Amino acid sequence: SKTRYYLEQCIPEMDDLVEKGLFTKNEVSLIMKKRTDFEHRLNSRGSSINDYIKYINYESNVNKLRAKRCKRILQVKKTNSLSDWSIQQRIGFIYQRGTNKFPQDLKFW
Amino acid sequence: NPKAFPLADAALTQQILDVVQQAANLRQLKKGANEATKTLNRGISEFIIMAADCEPIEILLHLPLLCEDKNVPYVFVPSRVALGRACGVSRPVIAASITTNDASAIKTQIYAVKDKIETLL
Amino acid sequence: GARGGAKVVIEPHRHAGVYIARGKEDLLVTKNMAPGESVYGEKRISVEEPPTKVEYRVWNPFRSKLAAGIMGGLDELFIAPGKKVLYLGAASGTSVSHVSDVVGPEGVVYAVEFSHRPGRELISMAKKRPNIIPIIEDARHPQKYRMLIGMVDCVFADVAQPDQARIIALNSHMFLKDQGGVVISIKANCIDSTVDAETVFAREVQKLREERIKPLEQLTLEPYERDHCIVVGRYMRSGLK
Amino acid sequence: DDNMRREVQRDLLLIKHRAALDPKRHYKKQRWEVPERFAIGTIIEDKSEFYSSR
Amino acid sequence: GDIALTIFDVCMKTLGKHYINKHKGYYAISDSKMNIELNKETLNYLFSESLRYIKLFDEFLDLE
Amino acid sequence: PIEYLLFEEPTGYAVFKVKLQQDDIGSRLKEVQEQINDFGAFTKLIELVSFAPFKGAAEALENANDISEGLVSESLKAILDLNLPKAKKNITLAISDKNLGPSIKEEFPYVDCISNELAQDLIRGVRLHGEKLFKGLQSGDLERAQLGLGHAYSRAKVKFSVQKNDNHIIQAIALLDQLDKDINTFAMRVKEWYGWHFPELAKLVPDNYTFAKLVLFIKDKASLNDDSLHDLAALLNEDSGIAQRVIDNARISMGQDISETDMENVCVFAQRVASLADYRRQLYDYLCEKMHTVAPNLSELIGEVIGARLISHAGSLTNLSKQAASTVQILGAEKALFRKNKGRISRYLANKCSMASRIDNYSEEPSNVFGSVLKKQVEQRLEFY
Amino acid sequence: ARIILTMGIRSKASETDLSEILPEEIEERVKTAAEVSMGTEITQTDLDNIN
RNA sequence: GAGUCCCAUAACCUUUGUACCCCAGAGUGAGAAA
């Protein structure tokens, strides 16, 4: 299935969060559970563009939470590791999938 | 571009009129536009001959519409005076038809003309 | 036989979109798409249904070759309600209009004609029948009217030309759906008058095989016509074996 | 309709046995069980056929 | 400012052309009177278009 | 070596990009042909990159002509210029038509066209799936536009004209009789309704149209003045004496007076009958005008109204001309349109009608010159018998 | 009938407003059908009488 | 309790009035006048 391939792409990110201590393992699991439902929704039949917008919004919110726990816990503006740029790259990847699937919707473009 | 089309040249016209004269002797000729329409409707017409000088020409331009629908060869000859003479009647004839008959004595001559008309069209 | 006031018991035919009117004599009929008029002066039958007045058109076998095919008993006609059909060599609405009746409002008929004079009556008929798209073009160059035609479930060829095997093939490749229908009416005199009618029919059948059209059936149209046979075939691109 | 009006019932009965109506006709051989869907219609003649078939 | 006016010129020609194609369908209009109406509507449509650029020119103070 | 594909829809031009190239040595195998049918298999071959819909109906016909002639329309030049990359090596374009190839090469030297059976197969798949390949992009509806374009393309070549149309003649006549039936019927009801209030006037003015007008003036019979007498005297003429009669009978009658509401309907209903008659007169002029412009020969020979009827019986001016002379005689033999010596003129006139009809039908701009000499010829026969 | 009065010709369908006669979804339908129509042009003489 | 749903808002027949007809019909297809 396509879904599992996309989920495993997240693992190196979730590993970095625990190692940096920003998120606990239980918290990290909850993020993956929400992604698992999203990443599945996109690849299954009946998907609409709104599913892409929801997932993009969710990933954007996770980026904010990481950015604040960085200064709160690590006390560093940018942690030099994979976690810094994974989300921003992922959100871009979601857009490229969305526009290919639904080139009609001008709002998404 | 002209309404009367195709118009047979001199050499072909001589051969067409010859067949008409032979057909008239054998009772295989229907003379006049009204008869010609009746033959096409009954689909017994080997081919139709028309006078390109018919005055006015439109009076017989209904036959091609019948001819093309039913897939019957047709041709225009320059003279109505000559066509009437070959037909054997004592008046001008603007349209004539060769009735279908596979038992005819002039079958080979008819088909010889029929191919040439088909090439012209 | 079928006089003006005479009345008939109309019951359906084995082929969908074809009906039989019984009586002292039997008539093949198809339901009128545009009630209240006749395109070539055929007889018409009116039935009162709950009450709306529907109208049936009498199909004369002697004028339309396809009709003569029904009466002789063609096993399979790919023309049926709700199917796109391409009619090549539509001289006028004598036979296309009947085909349009069979397909019904849902289906469409692509009538193709070359000569302008019979076409003018084709166009005037087409206005009364929305489901007919008349294409005044030469069937020998299908590329010219490719914009106008989509996939067509069946291709019906009444064209009287010596080289039929090419026109039917070229339009078959471009527009016929795989496993689609092909119905060709063959006139022995037109293709080659020098040889007997049987040889011509055998020759045309072989051409269709070379063009990947597996031929299913041949029927001779007598007594309705002399030296005519309708060959029904399927377009099998996968394999004709 | 299940009423099966006697006029329509007799109507179909003359088409089942149409071989005996006129001694010169002699149609083909067929059974023609009554169909489950049928209608009765009146022919309409062309105005050009006023004298021939009216 | 000559370059801008050139675009206005070519603009005003083609907009009229397409407006003729619309309001006409596939087919030319046989009636002479109706054709006059189409020419009017093009003109009126073109004037209402032309008037806008007069309004636009006001915005730019530096140019003549 | 195919990389870009050009497909033309009635709505517009569609350009695809070929992701994978199907096996060519095996093109005739069953597997590589089935995949064209299967959408899942086909979508892996090509992907849409561009689509430029036509501005309107007019442009669709113009390009539909150009594509037929193998030319490059300005819209087609635009879409290719935006899509095909500039290029020793030439970008390959797949096109259905070979005649279009050289024109594209002229405009674009850097593109090489292909139209072998490989190109035809990919074009076949595009046509098969149609709108499904556009990924929801708005392509209108391909079935409707084909119907509009198809009629547009055909009638452009054959050069149809509104001048030839005769359906107006068939339809105006169907109004002229229907109006006369209704104008008679409704006027008969005006007679009864106003008859109750005053039955005598129905006897005084038998002409129904005048009665509607006269009723419009003398609403209530009690209104009787010398000035009113002059007014109603102006209506029609006093020669009949109805003007003096109406006043005397108005003074003295057994008509029971009806309410103002009932009076209101009689005049309004009478006003309705007036409009139908006035419209019918206006139409009768229109039919006469159109018959001259459509069938001047036939109209001149027998008449505008009768010739219009004959066109209706035959069903169309084309059908009438196509008929034989004997058939035309019986076409109007139920209403005696053309009508022992009497019989001969009918049949003689019957032929001459067919003669005029043919001239009218197949003539782009029929004149009345031949109709006249034909009628004079029939006349000369008339005195002879 | 009221449609014929407001707009006489398919050409007029583009600028004519049918809101009072037809709802929104119907009126756009005739506007689109107007441009792709199969029927032929008519003279003002025909139009006046049809009005 | 009980067929509106085969138009009693109608069909068919008779009488009267109006306008016509007393030929053949997929009409025939070369005489007519002297």
Short mmCIF file of N, CA, C and O in Angstrom, two decimals, chain B residues 61-120:
data_model
loop_
_atom_site.label_atom_id
_atom_site.label_comp_id
_atom_site.label_asym_id
_atom_site.label_seq_id
_atom_site.Cartn_x
_atom_site.Cartn_y
_atom_site.Cartn_z
N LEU B 61 -34.10 19.86 -62.87
CA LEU B 61 -33.06 19.70 -61.87
C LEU B 61 -33.53 18.91 -60.66
O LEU B 61 -32.75 18.71 -59.72
N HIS B 62 -34.78 18.44 -60.65
CA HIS B 62 -35.22 17.55 -59.59
C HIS B 62 -34.73 16.13 -59.81
O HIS B 62 -34.60 15.36 -58.85
N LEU B 63 -34.47 15.75 -61.06
CA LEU B 63 -34.04 14.38 -61.33
C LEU B 63 -32.70 14.03 -60.69
O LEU B 63 -32.59 12.93 -60.12
N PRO B 64 -31.66 14.87 -60.75
CA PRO B 64 -30.39 14.48 -60.11
C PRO B 64 -30.54 14.15 -58.64
O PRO B 64 -29.90 13.21 -58.15
N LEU B 65 -31.37 14.91 -57.93
CA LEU B 65 -31.63 14.61 -56.53
C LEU B 65 -32.19 13.21 -56.37
O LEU B 65 -31.80 12.47 -55.46
N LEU B 66 -33.11 12.82 -57.26
CA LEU B 66 -33.55 11.44 -57.30
C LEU B 66 -32.42 10.51 -57.71
O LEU B 66 -32.25 9.43 -57.14
N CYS B 67 -31.64 10.90 -58.72
CA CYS B 67 -30.61 10.01 -59.24
C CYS B 67 -29.53 9.73 -58.20
O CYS B 67 -29.09 8.59 -58.03
N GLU B 68 -29.10 10.77 -57.49
CA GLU B 68 -28.00 10.60 -56.53
C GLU B 68 -28.46 9.82 -55.30
O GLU B 68 -27.68 9.05 -54.72
N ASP B 69 -29.71 10.02 -54.88
CA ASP B 69 -30.22 9.28 -53.73
C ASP B 69 -30.30 7.79 -54.04
O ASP B 69 -29.88 6.96 -53.23
N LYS B 70 -30.82 7.44 -55.21
CA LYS B 70 -31.04 6.05 -55.57
C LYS B 70 -29.84 5.41 -56.25
O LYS B 70 -29.90 4.23 -56.60
N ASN B 71 -28.76 6.17 -56.45
CA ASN B 71 -27.52 5.63 -57.02
C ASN B 71 -27.73 5.15 -58.45
O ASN B 71 -27.44 4.00 -58.79
N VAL B 72 -28.23 6.04 -59.30
CA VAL B 72 -28.48 5.77 -60.71
C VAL B 72 -27.64 6.74 -61.53
O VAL B 72 -27.73 7.95 -61.31
N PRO B 73 -26.82 6.27 -62.47
CA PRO B 73 -26.03 7.21 -63.28
C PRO B 73 -26.91 8.12 -64.11
O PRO B 73 -28.02 7.75 -64.49
N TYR B 74 -26.41 9.32 -64.38
CA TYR B 74 -27.14 10.31 -65.16
C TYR B 74 -26.13 11.15 -65.93
O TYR B 74 -24.95 11.22 -65.58
N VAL B 75 -26.62 11.81 -66.98
CA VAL B 75 -25.76 12.61 -67.85
C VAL B 75 -26.61 13.65 -68.55
O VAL B 75 -27.82 13.48 -68.73
N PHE B 76 -25.97 14.74 -68.96
CA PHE B 76 -26.61 15.82 -69.70
C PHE B 76 -26.04 15.85 -71.12
O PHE B 76 -24.82 15.76 -71.30
N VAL B 77 -26.92 15.98 -72.10
CA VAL B 77 -26.51 16.13 -73.49
C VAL B 77 -26.83 17.56 -73.92
O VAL B 77 -27.79 18.15 -73.41
N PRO B 78 -26.07 18.14 -74.84
CA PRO B 78 -26.23 19.58 -75.10
C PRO B 78 -27.55 19.96 -75.75
O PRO B 78 -28.02 21.08 -75.55
N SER B 79 -28.15 19.06 -76.53
CA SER B 79 -29.29 19.39 -77.38
C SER B 79 -30.53 18.67 -76.89
O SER B 79 -30.51 17.45 -76.70
N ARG B 80 -31.63 19.42 -76.70
CA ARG B 80 -32.92 18.76 -76.55
C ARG B 80 -33.51 18.40 -77.90
O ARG B 80 -34.24 17.41 -78.02
N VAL B 81 -33.22 19.20 -78.93
CA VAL B 81 -33.70 18.89 -80.27
C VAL B 81 -33.15 17.55 -80.74
O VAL B 81 -33.88 16.70 -81.24
N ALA B 82 -31.85 17.35 -80.57
CA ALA B 82 -31.24 16.09 -80.98
C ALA B 82 -31.77 14.94 -80.14
O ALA B 82 -32.04 13.86 -80.67
N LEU B 83 -31.92 15.14 -78.84
CA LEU B 83 -32.39 14.06 -77.98
C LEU B 83 -33.78 13.60 -78.40
O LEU B 83 -34.05 12.40 -78.46
N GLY B 84 -34.66 14.55 -78.71
CA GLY B 84 -35.99 14.17 -79.16
C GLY B 84 -35.96 13.41 -80.47
O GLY B 84 -36.73 12.47 -80.68
N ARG B 85 -35.06 13.81 -81.38
CA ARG B 85 -34.96 13.13 -82.67
C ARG B 85 -34.56 11.68 -82.49
O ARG B 85 -35.20 10.77 -83.04
N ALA B 86 -33.50 11.43 -81.72
CA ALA B 86 -33.06 10.06 -81.50
C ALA B 86 -34.13 9.24 -80.79
O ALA B 86 -34.29 8.05 -81.07
N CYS B 87 -34.87 9.86 -79.88
CA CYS B 87 -35.92 9.15 -79.18
C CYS B 87 -37.00 8.65 -80.13
O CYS B 87 -37.70 7.69 -79.80
N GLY B 88 -37.16 9.28 -81.29
CA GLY B 88 -38.12 8.85 -82.27
C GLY B 88 -39.47 9.53 -82.21
O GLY B 88 -40.33 9.24 -83.04
N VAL B 89 -39.68 10.43 -81.26
CA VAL B 89 -40.92 11.16 -81.15
C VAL B 89 -40.78 12.47 -81.90
O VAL B 89 -39.69 13.00 -82.08
N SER B 90 -41.91 13.03 -82.33
CA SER B 90 -41.91 14.18 -83.21
C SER B 90 -41.87 15.50 -82.46
O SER B 90 -42.31 16.52 -83.01
N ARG B 91 -41.38 15.52 -81.23
CA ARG B 91 -41.24 16.75 -80.46
C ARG B 91 -40.00 16.69 -79.58
O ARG B 91 -39.48 15.61 -79.31
N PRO B 92 -39.51 17.84 -79.13
CA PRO B 92 -38.34 17.84 -78.26
C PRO B 92 -38.62 17.07 -76.98
O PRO B 92 -39.74 17.10 -76.45
N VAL B 93 -37.60 16.38 -76.49
CA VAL B 93 -37.65 15.66 -75.22
C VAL B 93 -36.51 16.16 -74.36
O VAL B 93 -35.36 16.21 -74.81
N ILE B 94 -36.83 16.54 -73.12
CA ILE B 94 -35.82 17.09 -72.24
C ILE B 94 -35.22 16.03 -71.32
O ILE B 94 -34.10 16.20 -70.83
N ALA B 95 -35.95 14.94 -71.07
CA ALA B 95 -35.47 13.90 -70.17
C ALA B 95 -35.99 12.55 -70.65
O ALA B 95 -37.15 12.43 -71.06
N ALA B 96 -35.13 11.54 -70.58
CA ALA B 96 -35.49 10.19 -70.98
C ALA B 96 -34.78 9.19 -70.08
O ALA B 96 -33.72 9.48 -69.51
N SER B 97 -35.35 8.00 -69.97
CA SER B 97 -34.85 6.96 -69.07
C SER B 97 -34.75 5.64 -69.81
O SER B 97 -35.59 5.34 -70.66
N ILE B 98 -33.73 4.85 -69.47
CA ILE B 98 -33.56 3.52 -70.03
C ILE B 98 -34.01 2.50 -68.99
O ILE B 98 -33.33 2.29 -67.98
N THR B 99 -35.13 1.85 -69.25
CA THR B 99 -35.70 0.91 -68.30
C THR B 99 -34.77 -0.28 -68.13
O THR B 99 -34.06 -0.68 -69.05
N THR B 100 -34.75 -0.82 -66.91
CA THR B 100 -33.90 -1.97 -66.63
C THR B 100 -34.49 -3.22 -67.27
O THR B 100 -35.70 -3.45 -67.22
N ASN B 101 -33.62 -4.01 -67.89
CA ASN B 101 -34.05 -5.29 -68.46
C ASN B 101 -32.80 -6.13 -68.69
O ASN B 101 -31.96 -5.77 -69.51
N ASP B 102 -32.69 -7.24 -67.96
CA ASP B 102 -31.55 -8.14 -68.14
C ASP B 102 -31.73 -9.09 -69.32
O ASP B 102 -30.80 -9.83 -69.64
N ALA B 103 -32.90 -9.08 -69.96
CA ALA B 103 -33.15 -9.89 -71.15
C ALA B 103 -33.02 -9.08 -72.43
O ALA B 103 -33.43 -9.55 -73.50
N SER B 104 -32.46 -7.87 -72.36
CA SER B 104 -32.45 -6.97 -73.50
C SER B 104 -31.40 -7.39 -74.52
O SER B 104 -30.34 -7.92 -74.19
N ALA B 105 -31.71 -7.11 -75.79
CA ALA B 105 -30.77 -7.40 -76.86
C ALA B 105 -29.62 -6.42 -76.90
O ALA B 105 -28.56 -6.75 -77.44
N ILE B 106 -29.80 -5.22 -76.34
CA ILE B 106 -28.78 -4.18 -76.39
C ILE B 106 -28.15 -4.02 -75.02
O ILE B 106 -27.66 -2.93 -74.67
N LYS B 107 -28.16 -5.09 -74.22
CA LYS B 107 -27.59 -5.02 -72.88
C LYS B 107 -26.13 -4.58 -72.92
O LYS B 107 -25.74 -3.65 -72.20
N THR B 108 -25.32 -5.22 -73.76
CA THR B 108 -23.90 -4.92 -73.77
C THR B 108 -23.64 -3.47 -74.14
O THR B 108 -22.77 -2.81 -73.56
N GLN B 109 -24.39 -2.96 -75.12
CA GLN B 109 -24.22 -1.57 -75.52
C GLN B 109 -24.61 -0.62 -74.39
O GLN B 109 -23.96 0.40 -74.17
N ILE B 110 -25.68 -0.95 -73.66
CA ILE B 110 -26.11 -0.09 -72.55
C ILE B 110 -25.02 -0.03 -71.49
O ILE B 110 -24.61 1.05 -71.05
N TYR B 111 -24.52 -1.20 -71.06
CA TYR B 111 -23.52 -1.21 -70.01
C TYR B 111 -22.24 -0.52 -70.45
O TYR B 111 -21.53 0.08 -69.63
N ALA B 112 -21.93 -0.57 -71.75
CA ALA B 112 -20.77 0.15 -72.24
C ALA B 112 -20.90 1.64 -71.97
O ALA B 112 -19.95 2.30 -71.53
N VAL B 113 -22.09 2.20 -72.22
CA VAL B 113 -22.32 3.61 -71.93
C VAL B 113 -22.37 3.84 -70.42
O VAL B 113 -21.87 4.86 -69.93
N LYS B 114 -22.96 2.91 -69.68
CA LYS B 114 -23.16 3.14 -68.25
C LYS B 114 -21.82 3.32 -67.54
O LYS B 114 -21.70 4.18 -66.65
N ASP B 115 -20.81 2.54 -67.92
CA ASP B 115 -19.49 2.73 -67.33
C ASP B 115 -18.95 4.11 -67.64
O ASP B 115 -18.38 4.77 -66.76
N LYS B 116 -19.11 4.57 -68.88
CA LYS B 116 -18.54 5.86 -69.25
C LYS B 116 -19.22 7.00 -68.50
O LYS B 116 -18.55 7.96 -68.08
N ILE B 117 -20.54 6.93 -68.33
CA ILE B 117 -21.21 7.95 -67.52
C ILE B 117 -20.67 7.93 -66.10
O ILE B 117 -20.42 8.99 -65.51
N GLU B 118 -20.47 6.74 -65.54
CA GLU B 118 -19.98 6.63 -64.17
C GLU B 118 -18.61 7.27 -64.03
O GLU B 118 -18.33 7.96 -63.04
N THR B 119 -17.73 7.05 -65.01
CA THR B 119 -16.42 7.69 -64.97
C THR B 119 -16.55 9.20 -65.00
O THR B 119 -15.81 9.91 -64.32
N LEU B 120 -17.48 9.71 -65.80
CA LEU B 120 -17.62 11.16 -65.94
C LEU B 120 -18.06 11.80 -64.63
O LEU B 120 -17.55 12.85 -64.24
#
